[model samples]
Target: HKSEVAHRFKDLGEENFKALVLIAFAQYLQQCPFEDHVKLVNEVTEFAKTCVADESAENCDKSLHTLFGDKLCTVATLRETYGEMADCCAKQEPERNECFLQHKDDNPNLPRLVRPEVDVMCTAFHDNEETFLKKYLYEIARRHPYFYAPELLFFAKRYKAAFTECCQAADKAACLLPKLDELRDEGKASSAKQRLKCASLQKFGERAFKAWAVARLSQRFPKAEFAEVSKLVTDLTKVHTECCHGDLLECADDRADLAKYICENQDSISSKLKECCEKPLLEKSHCIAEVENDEMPADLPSLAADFVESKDVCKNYAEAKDVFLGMFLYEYARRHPDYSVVLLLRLAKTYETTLEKCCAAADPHECYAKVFDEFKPLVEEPQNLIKQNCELFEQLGEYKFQNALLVRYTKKVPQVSTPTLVEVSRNLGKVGSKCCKHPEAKRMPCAEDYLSVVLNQLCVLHEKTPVSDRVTKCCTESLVNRRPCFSALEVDETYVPKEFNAETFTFHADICTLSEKERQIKKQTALVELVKHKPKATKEQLKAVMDDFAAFVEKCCKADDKETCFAEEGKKLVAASQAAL
Candidate 1:
């Protein structure tokens, strides 16, 4: 056997090594006459392992070690052997073409020339390829099972490619449902054994089912194009339901549900796939990397895989504060290359929680870094990203909010003091003055927009956190500044009208809702009430009890409702100031 194999390739170099192995493996794969498939598999597997070991000894055992660290187990190795044999099986199936011809001839009026045999052969080899690929991948997964951020990027590119292929294939089949169903049944039915380890096989089935349903809807309705795409968008959602719990074979009852939705909104499916699937993946791949102490692999697959794994914690959180903490660490970490500042700040911030979790003995920075590395890719953007995330975080609360007072404080003189909520806001007046500046401060969202967010967070946090000791003078001032003023509600006789002058426009400031001094008194009174109410009532609480009859105003019965209104019909000195003339 050795002599015969040696004769096949003259010498072992890069080209011949790959070619000869592929050639020999093709025969060895078919359970052919040359040798038993299992024996050849074991032999080559051992040889590959040996070569890997030798290579590792020469280097410092980085990714080569990562790759070859785990050997495939018995069942997995057998699956791999079968995959290698599929090439030979492909050669024996000459009937594949015959099947195509027969299919075409049989269905002379059939929609498409899809031979069942092509599908059968493709399914067989494709399943084998898939199982082998997943088996190898799980080996890598085992190698980094402990959750390292960089190691998780390994699947990013592979997932992107697989996801893209699935969508493109789905789109191409958008008009051919009947053909797909025929091929699905004609192809060898997936066995229980085949699906036992393949978690994704069922998912693909559900996916294929959705595509077929989409195509089926298109075929059933000639007028589908003019209808709203929202119906089609709802159609694709059936895949999620079917994949998780129900068997596709038993999904006939659900087809009507899918059809109805697609009939109403089929066009939207394409947008969902592009927006929710492809665009997000593409954007995520470029912008987000893993956070961890583990080094990333030189290869694309490993890096992508690691990234996908790392995204679980990055995208959603158990709570808003948890989300903010993770995001802030990433934001702060961006200022440092080694990520030290991020680790330190996370420790400094979460010292109480970490200590309570029995991790108190650990250094705050060290412990924080250790936990963060696994979730870095999710949160590693700059401060602007943090601001964006904080805005998003604030939305979960029920009340309309001002920006987190923290932003205002971060902009004050010296820039580092943690201010009380009220004091933190005083610096916001700087926005009015245009003196509050940072490198990107101008690019920062509008003062009102950010202020709304901070106020929301402060409002929410007032309920959530027990110890509210942190505060600064400017922050307090800003909070006070935000108190609503009702001076504009009063009436005054002094009037000024807008004038369209020869040039463009002119302002008339003589108009008054109240005397200037009177308005000042009302503003001061409102500020006092706001302070009095601040500690006792949350925004929600205040909204509940406050008299909002117009914030409590009501039209009175002409004479009797005097206590409820300001009537008395005080006639007398009516005064007016003329405009323009």
Candidate 2:
């Protein structure tokens, strides 16, 4: 149409490119017989093929743009009436206003809209737009249920409703379900555009069928039937178990929940599709086995009784299987009185692992349900486990550690002779320490508790000193090694310039801090204090110690500087110390 009849093609803008392409396609359809439509499609295709720009074509950009979208667009569609299809939805859709007067109804099978337009909407998309993985999101999330966040629940429901409406309108199309097997032939498989249009029509049938099952189950069951026992089962067996991913089947107990939901909540939905009771027992045998849970139908009773105290309540489902699930549930129950939160967490993690292991054996139903239910909530949980755990450990450290230490080490350390809480708290320095490291320390129960324990232990051994000398040596060695935390500091204190004697001194000093002249006064004072502490010392002993100190310092300075100053004296002292050693 953008050729001799260029004016016939309206420029509705790029957003409507697919529809416009279809309009051109429909116009092309009028000029060719249904059998020769493929030839017309190739005519356009060849034009596009040759349109490749390499310093060729009239106004390459404009010529390429006009022919490109229309050419690469959908060529064939799968339909029962016409073997393979072409795009012409505006021509054939009953509700679509007639655009081309040359269109005829004689050919029953004709192609529809192309590309993203054929995607349309589905029940899952309509009910939960947020959770429903768009084509874009699904590729990234890899169909994992956790990809859907919990906050999206509101949108999911609306998307489902919209999807339901679309499906209902395609009732006539749903009739082609059985014929799909035949339509998927080598020649008739058609272009992706045609397949999508046909697929949308097919999903409409699926929505109706599933909605029917949900409605029937709800209408037949009463409110009282959903008692505490059923609710627990629904939570455990239905949501976690059945909703978990597996190779071929899913969880029966979980399916039981979906059945119950359908049986009860079908009334909540205002759609025309009524619920039906027959939900093909969501393939669960494969699921149970695949999840590493026991597939034994008769062994569940003993397992449940062994794990749960409410033995009678769980007998039926327990008698239902013998697998790791019962053991997990039992251990979880022993650890927690209320099981919902823990159970949900376990199932989410379990399904993720299972999906990884069983991708080759995946059952779409199990995968779908898990992504929708079990995982979505888990994903919604903050991705901050490390921070949360650190906080908990810190808070617990505050109190529990103190109590444990005090009680455990009552006889171990001599310092805790009738130790009072006041002394313990003061020496521990919790109030001061809290302000320093984690001022938000109060926010964490573990930190205060951990500190309390450390203090209690320290209090018991308050009189006994730590290995301070050994620790000091290690720190000195660390500095020598140039550990990440600390390095040499040779620069001047003010402008941070290094002191250098123009001729004798070098930039890189081999001397330790004790060898520096700036530190000489402090060193002499330390030696004097040591001398005073000794009750008495011979002149020889005192001189030897001082000389040893001086010689060590001289070695650290430049050799030239040492020679220019007291090289002879420094050597004598160092020699004396070596002789003493």
Candidate 3:
């Protein structure tokens, strides 16, 4: 079989024989043990040098090593196992094209790898011949099960014409090397499996670079007529794509090559683009306006901004605090490259109310300390405030309790409505005093529990009585005529508002007929006794309770019968007042 193969290859002449043998060897390396594969490639290297023209022998050796020495892999076995498909790669450029076409047209059952891989190679060569040689010899060849080092060398030598033609672009090597180095590093980090790993990054950078360039050019030279900016964009994109085809990260971060290209090609680019500077003042503004309207799509700049903003503040919370506070929050954002201005803006807005409340304090530092202490545990972990399933209001009560304290201590109490703001603080403080001592208390649940209870009751009350009814005066003359509207006489005062029946009516002494003045005197007397008898009423508390009664009476007690009206509205009012406190 070896003799027959060698005899057949002899007819194809030295270059084709070497090419075929090298391709076969590349496939052989895929299936063979690593040590044997290395040995076989080294042996094939000498013959590949002989097959290459003297001028390009060294170039062939490097291409051979790049393909066989690194990026080891298996490819679709059909290409390696078959003979008809194997010879296509060994042909000259024109013959190779004809050969592939003939094979595809004739062989209906040719494998998936054969068509797709070879098809891409042909397209790549025609589209980008400089890169096509490297890609065909390295990227394409590695897809098959077998490849020979010399086969890569042979093509690298043969494709010199295509290589020089494309390399003649002034920005070719200048723009490409940095990106290539970047992709090389990424590929190494990824432990790349038989292909360029940074391919996607390369593509993203190319597209982003062109868009960026177009925007900058349009903006910078606004008065310049840029009618062919789109065509310029295409040309710039092609340059970047070719330069950073396999390695984009390095190229993307630096635009020196792109800048250089634009500066060097300014004559061509500026020829179509009218400069804003050349226009009259009125015309310049119009030209500038045209450029201003060309808003480039957010691509890399947006991505970079997102990346900076997405960094967690909690990662080094103390350091972040130092940076955040040492320079003012906005100042810190300006100073730190890693911090995002937009993120700072959002964070400032979120805490703006808190800052306003805290900063107004007699002791702003103390106020902030308290605020930070309350929020420290929460912000330490990465929690999405919206996504969290917990009842946020319950947690909010803790903050509310603090705010209530601030108001109680910092502001005059009586200026506010009764149950005074002070009363709300006192009630919350009482919850803590009562429940903070429980052994099982992780956090004193009293504030949250009290808040929850109040909220639940309010919600339940809203559900039971329509809002209009809840606010409706209880002893209206219209109400007085309906079933006497004085059913509180028999009803237990301890029962909730919802338990009281509105329809039941019984006249206990027919006190509903009393004069308005008599009702007022009687209402005051009852409230005075009520406050006097209350367990915890201080002088101030007494005053507040009395004032609340006066307000409640003024709103809900229009009936002249003091006893009946007080009896009807008293329980509901007292319960609501107590609950509020």
Best by lDDT: 3
- Write one digit per residue (lDDT tens) for candidate 2, span 499-527: 32222211123334344433532443333
The sequence of per-residue lDDT tens digits that candidate 1 reaches over residues 1-581 is 22322321232333323322323232212222233333544554445444444544322233211221121112243344445322222332343222222211111221333333433433443557533333333333232222111212323234334433443353433423444453332221222212221333353444333332233333223232313322442444453354233222123224434434432443442222222222222132222111112221223232222212343332233334333333333323222323222223333244325423523333433343344354454234434343553444346321112223322222222112223433334324323233123233332223432343344344344445433222222223322132112101122212222232322111112212456545333323332233232322334443343223112222322335444243222110001101201
- Taken over the whole model, the C-alpha lDDT of each candidate is 0.31, 0.33, 0.37
Model 3: CA > 4 A from native: 1-84, 87-92, 95-236, 239-581
Model 1 lDDT on a 0 to 1 scale: 0.31
Instruction: Judging by TM-score, tell me the better candidate of 1 and 2.
Output: 1
Model 3 agreement with the true structure over 156-214: per-residue lDDT tens digits: 55345433443445655554344444543333322221122123225344533443344
Model 1 vs. true fold: TM? 0.18
Candidate 2 global TM-score: 0.17
* Highest-scoring model, TM-score: 3
Cα RMSD (angstroms) for every candidate in the order listed: 29.1, 28.0, 31.5
Model 1: worst 10 consecutive residues (lDDT sum) = 571-580
* Candidate 1 RMSD to the correct structure: 29.1
